[PDB]
Design a protein around this nucleic acid. Structure first.
Length: 68
RNA sequence: AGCUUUGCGCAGUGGCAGUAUCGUAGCCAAUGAGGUUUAUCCGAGGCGCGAUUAUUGCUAAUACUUUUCCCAAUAC
């Protein structure tokens, strides 16, 4: 997942650098929000897979079409 | 006043393929999906789940017997 993470980190770093180039969000709210988003998307990737049901065999046993 | 371009609908005439089509009050996505090549470069859907003849509807093929009429003198 490291390249998928690197793309996201690069995008959010571009956003933070554009934020900082005008010296706005001096205290650091935007960076904290972007880091929180990055961490949440990282946890989503590593979140354990959902519970998935087993499909039983249908039945051991009707008209059919015909054309081109 | 014709000619013509783009996108969207309604149709008609064809051709091609059934290992693919569709759904997504599930998740993520141009504040970036995905990146094997062309990476100080490209640029959209992707994942999971679900339905199924790997889209779905029709149409057709897989049979003859009920009834309802009857006998009689030109005679003790």
């Amino acid at each position: 997942l490291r390249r998928k993470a690197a793309r996201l980190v690069a995008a959010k770093c571009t956003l933070a650098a554009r934020v900082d180039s005008f010296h706005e969000s001096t205290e650091g709210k935007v960076g904290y929000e972007l880091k929180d988003e990055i961490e949440r998307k990282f946890d989503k990737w590593q979140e354990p897979p959902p519970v998935k049901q087993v499909k039983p065999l249908p039945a051991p046993l009707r008209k059919k079409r015909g054309g081109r």
